[PDB]
Design a protein around this ligand. Structure first.
Ligand SMILES: N#Cc1cnc(-c2cccnc2)nc1N1C[C@@H]2C[C@H]1CN2c1cccc(Cl)c1
Lengths: 170, 930
């Protein structure tokens, strides 16, 4: 007066055939997960590297912004001193050099923006990878528990370890 | 492109932009700068070039004052090529070390600041302070103390003959050959060489094995040293050098709760960044934990439907009071994807300590950034053995939002030791039953052991582990009573202490007791278990722990320990779940070890070049044939930056070994999937051998091979400890980074396959290398080594053993390589004799009963010694489950070693079954060859 069994086939050779199939189906889905878990980990390392590179752009720009600050403060004394000296040459050389400085900050900002766009994309990939991982997990767990239920069924029935291994091992 | 366009920011706001060479050092770049600044505004205001230092944003996103100007811009690796002139200002020492720390550990110190974490800030403050103190304290003491820190004695674990020795002094061509016995103390041997003419005293001196940082000193005989012992067996003269105490100083000189009876509960607010199937609905299963076992039953949420941002707002109540939570209570979450249940996918998980690092019961909101659930054999609901540290991918990774409710107006702590010890105070058939459970050579048994817990302390002190497990940690009464006993428990031996470090015993008092018992470890024995102790840190709740303090203590007392602690920690910095913990320990290590910091920088640069040199060869193998790729490898090595970086460094594998001059012609790469580099060295200051190599591997994981090699080295030590040298070759193996590391090159050897491919070639090969009287020695080397590697491989369960992965030295010594699989994973691996090995063992005869019986004794004796130390291997293997090796992951994998050593059986029962398994291997030797 007890029930439990979930195995489909009835004959020993018929159940052992399904043991070979579900095992082959299990080992393929495991290789699929492992392939996806390599990408997950690789993308996790790539995204972190992009995020520290963005911090690098920030710290670089921050150094250029200090140079701007210093140029404005430091020029003040000399731009007046050379204008009373009638030296519009020495004034004009300072400002073009400062215009050149600011032109470089726009190059560095554009590059920071391109990486931010690439980090936005790779954050999306990471999530899609994680989604496909979580869509494969239920099958992977399904196929494991089936495989084991068939193993136990045949082991209870007395099937020797050598017959089991040739269904599994191949 | 050879040259780079570099941005220069002068301190007057002026901006130059001109090209310089990648291989140009900073000092040269500064001369080119000043020559150009000349013809730009505001030059007259500048100080001279030496007044300023260049500054860049390094690869780890921090500003670095570039104090070493004999340093190439390609070796600086600035994020973008931007150099800022700044004042040579403030404390140069603290700014320099912080920058080098960041480049050495592969993680910027600002990343620690950015967390805004008190626990991290309190760790950094305390550990850097403690480590600096020890290092400052180190520098005060004399040359005796310092040589022992720096170059500690390499000793073997018994005849009394005599042979000559080559001795000389430092900075001198003329050398002195003269006699000395094997049992002479090195104090006496120095005086003999000091008698030059008939000036100086020999107590102001030490002996150094020239061409390596190994030193012969202290109250120990000459034969117990590794160099002299190695010299005696091979038959060569020890080449040494006298060194003055002043010369050693020249090296040295560098610088309330129990009232709160309300049930424990938590508010589950929201989820974040969940990625799942839109058809299903999401569930959050949860439970409280202490170690492995539960504190109470597991609750569960309602089925809120699948989206990115699922909201619950549920009260979750647990069957346990707030007063009953132990110090190391552990709330564990698992997010699951379930079907609607009208008729199971684990998404991710996260654990949290209910109390904090200052014993405060946590209150308020927490955002637990979840780790994804990797599917495994025992598919449990929750992952209580997983780390309590939050996922450092805060931008993209999934998150659960929770709120611990307020328990009182004032903040509630966990009771201190005094109030724990206050409540802690309060012939027979019981004595026979208790002995039966513990003297083994279940809830009924647990409640017996608990009742007689004080009798366990008096009569069964080694049974503490069993008593800690039977204790009910979900009742603060029982917890209080157990800790009381632990506070006055007798000191256990190292073997038992190792067990107490396992994840089953999380309580801070148990670890503290464990570490208290581990302080008797010598540096030699501690080194044998260093790999296991490092991995136990992954089970720690908090950052400041006793094991971290212990490992740092030992790392600062001994430069060899510090070296290997460093690389064990450094090799896992790519792994998110320990990057933080390991990062901080390494920072603390460096600040107390600023001398070795220099050596480790030189290695890390070398290992950065080789990675690049491997990556080139990997691609250049697919493009062209090998002889051209070999030449294209050399051209890249000839480059000034490469050549210097690979030259003149201490070996990471053995810091006493000096890798001086790269023999670029000898250098190549082995034929394999990942194409590892065969890098050869030579040292003209060294002894008779004077030729070392390293295999740089990148692509494959080496942790498996190290564990295996670690455990054979331990067998060899255990055998040698019982007066049994099986002539094993414990070659070095060291993981250095992400799927990267080094292997020591054993010279004068080849695989058996390639000896056989070129009647029986194995015994012929040994004949050509050991002519005449030498052959009888070479077969004994083979016999002894074949014995040890047969027993080792059997006990560890290492299958796949074939001619392509077994090697033989010209001396006769046999040994194994490429330990991909162990513990029978991929069914018991049988004991394996080969016809070829038996052929050589018997001296090329049909029946050599005399010789083969000696060999059977060597296998039998080897196997018996490991059974005596069987608990040692089980305990060490139990702690390595923390490492997450695929084949060392559960009790079954540990059970393998129990069965293979026959620990359940008696001693003579083990010998009988070993002989049976021996005999069957001799039987199956004939059938395999045909
Ligand atoms: N295959 C293989 C092989 C793997 N591993 C080890 C090893 C392992 C631990 C320590 N020492 C050595 N030796 C190996 N042998 C291959 C031959 C003999 C020896 C090194 N030789 C070599 C040298 C340079 C380039 C190339 Cl193509 C071949």
């Amino acid at each position: 007066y007890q029930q439990d069994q979930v195995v489909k086939e009835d004959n020993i050779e018929a159940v052992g055939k399904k043991l070979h199939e579900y095992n082959t189906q299990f080992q393929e889905k495991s290789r699929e997960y492992d392939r996806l878990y390599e990408d997950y980990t690789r993308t996790s390392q790539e995204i972190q590297m992009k995020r520290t590179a963005i911090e690098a752009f920030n710290e670089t720009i921050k150094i250029f912004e200090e140079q701007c600050q210093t140029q404005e403060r430091y020029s003040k004394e000399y731009i007046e001193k050379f204008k009373r000296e009638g030296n519009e040459t020495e004034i004009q050389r300072i400002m073009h050099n400062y215009e050149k400085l600011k032109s470089r900050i726009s190059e560095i900002v554009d590059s920071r923006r391109r990486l931010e766009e690439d980090l936005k994309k790779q954050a999306a990939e990471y999530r899609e990878i994680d989604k496909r991982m979580n869509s494969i997990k239920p099958d992977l767990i399904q196929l494991r528990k089936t495989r084991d239920q068939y193993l136990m069924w045949l082991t209870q029935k007395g099937v020797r370890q050598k017959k089991l291994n040739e269904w599994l091992g191949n | 492109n050879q040259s780079v366009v570099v941005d220069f920011l002068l301190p007057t706001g002026v901006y130059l932009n001109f090209p310089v060479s990648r291989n140009a050092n900073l000092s040269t770049i500064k001369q080119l700068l000043w020559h150009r600044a000349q013809y730009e505004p505001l030059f007259h205001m500048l100080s001279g070039p030496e007044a300023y230092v260049f500054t860049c944003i390094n690869q780890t996103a921090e500003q670095q004052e570039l104090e070493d100007e004999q340093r190439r811009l390609c070796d600086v690796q600035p994020f973008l090529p931007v150099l800022r002139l700044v004042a040579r200002e403030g404390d140069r020492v603290k700014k320099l070390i912080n920058s080098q720390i960041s480049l050495l550990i592969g993680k910027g110190l600002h990343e620690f600041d950015s967390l805004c974490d008190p626990e991290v800030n309190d760790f950094r403050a305390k550990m850097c302070q403690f480590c600096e103190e020890a290092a400052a304290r180190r520098q005060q003491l004399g040359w005796e103390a310092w040589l022992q820190y720096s170059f500690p004695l390499q000793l073997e674990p018994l005849p009394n003959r005599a042979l000559l020795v080559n001795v000389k002094f430092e900075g001198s061509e003329e050398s002195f050959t003269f006699q000395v016995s094997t049992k002479d103390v090195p104090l006496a041997l120095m005086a003999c060489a000091l008698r030059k003419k008939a000036v100086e005293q020999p107590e102001d001196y030490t002996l150094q094995v020239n061409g390596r940082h190994e030193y012969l000193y202290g109250s120990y005989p000459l034969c117990q040293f590794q160099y002299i012992c190695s010299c005696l067996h091979s038959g060569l003269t020890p080449h040494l050098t006298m060194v003055h105490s002043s010369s050693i100083l020249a090296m040295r000189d560098e610088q309330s709760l129990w009232s709160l009876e309300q049930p424990f509960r938590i508010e589950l607010i929201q989820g974040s960044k969940v990625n799942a199937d839109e058809r299903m609905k999401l569930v959050v299963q949860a439970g409280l934990f202490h170690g492995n076992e539960m504190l109470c039953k597991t609750v569960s949420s309602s089925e809120v439907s699948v989206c990115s941002e699922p909201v619950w707002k549920q009260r979750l109540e647990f069957d346990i009071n707030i007063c009953d939570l132990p110090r190391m209570a552990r709330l564990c979450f698992a997010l699951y994807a379930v079907i609607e249940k009208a008729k199971d996918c684990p998404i991710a998980w996260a654990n949290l300590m209910l109390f904090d690092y200052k014993d405060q019961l946590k209150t308020g909101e927490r955002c637990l950034y979840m780790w994804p659930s990797v599917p495994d054999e025992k598919g449990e609901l929750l992952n209580p053995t997983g780390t309590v540290r939050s996922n450092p991918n805060t931008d993209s990774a999934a998150a659960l939002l929770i709120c611990l409710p307020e328990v009182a107006p004032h903040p509630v702590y966990y009771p201190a030791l005094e109030k724990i010890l206050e409540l802690g105070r309060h012939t027979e058939e019981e004595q026979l039953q208790l002995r039966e459970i513990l003297e083994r050579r279940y809830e009924h048994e647990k409640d017996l052991v608990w009742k007689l817990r004080h009798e366990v302390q008096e009569h069964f002190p080694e049974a503490l582990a069993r008593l800690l497990l039977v204790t009910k940690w979900n009742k603060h009464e029982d917890v209080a009573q157990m800790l009381y006993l632990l506070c006055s428990w007798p000191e256990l031996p190292v073997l038992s202490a190792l067990e107490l470090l396992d994840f089953s015993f999380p309580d801070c008092h148990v670890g503290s007791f464990a570490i208290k018992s581990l302080r008797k470890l010598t540096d030699d024995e501690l080194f044998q278990y260093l790999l296991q102790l490092v991995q136990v840190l992954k089970y720690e709740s908090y950052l400041d722990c006793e094991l971290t303090k212990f490992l740092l203590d030992r790392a600062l007392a001994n430069r060899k320990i510090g070296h290997f602690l460093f690389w064990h920690l450094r090799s896992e910095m790519h792994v998110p779940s320990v990057a933080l913990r390991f990062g901080l320990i390494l920072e603390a290590y460096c600040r107390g070890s600023t001398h070795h910091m220099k050596v480790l920088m030189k290695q890390g640069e070398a290992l950065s070049k080789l990675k690049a040199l491997n990556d080139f060869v990997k691609l250049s193998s697919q493009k062209t044939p090998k002889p051209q790729t070999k030449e294209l490898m050399h051209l890249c090595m000839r480059q000034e930056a490469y050549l210097e970086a690979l030259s003149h460094l201490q070996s990471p594998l053995d810091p006493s070994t000096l890798l001086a001059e790269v023999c670029v012609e000898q250098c190549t790469f082995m034929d394999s999937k990942m194409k590892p580099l065969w890098i050869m060295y030579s040292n003209e200051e060294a002894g008779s051998g004077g030729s070392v190599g390293i295999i740089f591997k990148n692509g494959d994981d080496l942790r498996q091979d190290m564990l295996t090699l670690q455990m054979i080295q331990l067998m060899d030590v255990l055998w040698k400890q019982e007066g049994l040298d099986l002539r094993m070759t414990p070659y070095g193996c060291l993981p250095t980074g992400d799927r990267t590391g080094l292997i020591e090159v054993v010279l004068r050897s080849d695989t058996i396959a390639n000896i056989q491919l070129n009647k029986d070639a194995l015994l012929n090969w040994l004949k050509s290398k050991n002519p005449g009287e030498a052959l009888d020695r070479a077969i004994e080397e083979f016999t002894l080594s074949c014995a040890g590697y047969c027993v080792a491989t059997y006990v560890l369960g290492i299958g796949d053993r074939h001619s392509d992965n077994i090697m033989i030295r010209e001396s006769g010594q046999l040994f194994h390589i490429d330990f991909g699989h162990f513990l029978g994973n991929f069914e018991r691996v049988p004991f394996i004799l080969t016809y070829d090995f038996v052929h050589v063992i018997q001296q090329g005869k049909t029946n050599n009963s005399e010789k083969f019986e000696r060999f059977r004794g060597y296998c039998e004796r080897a196997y018996t010694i490991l059974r005596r130390h069987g608990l040692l291997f089980l305990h060490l293997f139990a702690l390595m489950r923390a490492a997450g090796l695929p084949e060392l992951s559960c009790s079954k994998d540990i059970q393998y070693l129990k069965d293979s050593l026959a620990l359940g059986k008696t001693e003579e029962e083990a010998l009988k079954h070993f002989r049976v398994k021996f005999n069957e291997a001799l039987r199956e030797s004939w059938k395999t060859k045909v």
